[PDB]
Design a protein around this ligand. Structure first.
Ligand code: NA
Lengths: 164, 164
């Protein structure tokens, strides 16, 4: 059915939590193994809202089925016009345009807020994510080999970028 | 004369400050434009020490002529075995082998401390710095274009890595 894209509120935190923890448990999309709690997600959203970094949710039949945001790429003031983005789709809702719609809307937000470069950091083995980012105009930069670890395995990070 | 490489002490802080502010003012090696004070560097050093991250200095004819350190590449637990390194040489002592000697010793400290990957982020035009890192076994990962800004210019970031 119809996808509503809007900004996240406190009311959405249970959904955001469930989606985030699912990715922590089951995937190589988040390189942490630590499940978080509601307090953690409140602080995450609060700090996003505080710094003026958007959090968008996708809502279907009254249910949040995905979310996206961007945040700082690197601390230094020299990187202030660069932001690193993340998109999460609920595992039950893959394939239907949620991730692509979220990414497209986030890109428009970034433009309005004068972000210069969006950066995606993608686990290098994830061909689907790589092509989908490519399809909205991201370009490969390069891979940092074995810079991550999860489940005792070394992970490679592919960076892509889109210049606005 | 020959260099002495050793760990930084609180006594070295005026020298560290001078080298750091020189880099801020006069180079594209640090993509901050804001000068700092002695207290800033005191907190920086204290936090390095506290967190288990080495700070090395090079001493020649009694004077500190450069320093090097490494710290977290990215905040998240997934990246705990990756560190990003920096090497600064006095503006009036460039081209004298200091940076290469510092890098070499920092690499050994990293090895000892069980770092898995060292990352260098280098302004892409700095062919000297790239060749220096390459001489120590770093390989190019790729370039993120226009991700920094300094002196009103967009700047390109080349990542290199060394797996220990
Ligand atoms: Na909006």
């Amino acid at each position: 059915m119809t996808l509503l894209i809007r900004h996240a509120t406190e009311a959405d935190l249970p959904a955001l939590l469930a989606i985030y923890n699912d990715a922590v448990e089951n995937t190589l999309a988040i390189w942490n193994e630590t499940l978080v709690d509601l307090e953690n997600r409140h602080q995450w959203l609060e700090n996003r809202n505080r710094d003026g970094f958007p959090v968008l949710v996708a809502e279907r039949e009254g249910q949040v089925v995905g979310y996206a945001s961007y945040g700082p790429f690197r601390p230094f003031e020299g990187f202030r016009h660069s932001s690193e983005l993340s998109v999460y789709v609920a595992s039950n809702a893959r394939g239907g345009g949620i991730g692509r719609t979220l990414l497209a809307e986030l890109i428009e937000e970034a433009r309005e807020r004068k972000v210069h470069v969006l950066i995606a950091g993608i686990e290098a083995g994830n061909a689907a994510s790589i092509a989908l980012h490519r399809s909205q105009g991201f370009e490969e930069c390069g891979t940092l080999k074995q810079v991550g670890q999860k489940f005792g395995r070394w992970l490679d990070l592919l960076f892509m970028q889109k210049i606005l």
